[PDB]
């Protein structure tokens, strides 16, 4: 995660192990620029995800006519005008929880009960 690019080379910095100072540096297999490892974690794989559950929530989601309105009150705004929609993770196993969006604070909440 969090790729790093070079400068004056701009390619992406692979990690090159420093054993002597004994830490991780990021090389640049084209121009020899280097720097540290801002964190020893290198790679993630992320089988079961929980992102895209709010894909493209723009400040205009309130301006889309086709989205179903709903009346519940935002925990923050305590306003009762909010559009909502299922989780945008277009995949089969996906749950059927609801993401609301208050038209006032643009705060996102959920209809959940298992985990908020």
């Amino acid at each position: 995660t969090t790729f790093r690019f070079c400068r004056d080379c701009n390619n992406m910095l692979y990690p090159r192990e420093d054993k002597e100072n004994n830490r991780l540096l990021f090389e640049c297999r084209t121009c020899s620029y280097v720097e540290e490892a801002g964190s020893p974690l290198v790679y993630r794989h992320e089988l079961i995800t929980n992102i895209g559950e709010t894909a493209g929530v723009v400040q205009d989601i309130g301006s889309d006519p086709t989205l179903p309105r709903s009346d519940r009150e935002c925990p923050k705004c305590h306003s009762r005008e909010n559009v909502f929609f299922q989780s945008q993770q277009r995949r089969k196993d996906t749950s059927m929880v609801l993401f609301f969006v208050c038209l006032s604070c643009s705060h996102i909440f959920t209809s959940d009960q298992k985990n908020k």
Binding site: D64, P65, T66, P68
Partner: protein, 41 residues
């Protein structure tokens, strides 16, 4: 006069059509009449 628009099938994705004006625009029965649903939209 901007009273009626042509709508293709792609554009149709982003509109919300009412079925008939009366039964659907104003906000808020014969049992022989068929059963419809509301202007909740």
């Amino acid at each position: 006069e901007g009273l009626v628009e042509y709508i293709d099938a792609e554009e149709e994705e982003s509109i919300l059509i009412a079925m008939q004006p009366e039964d659907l625009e104003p906000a808020e029965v014969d049992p022989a009449k068929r059963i419809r649903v509301s202007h909740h939209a």
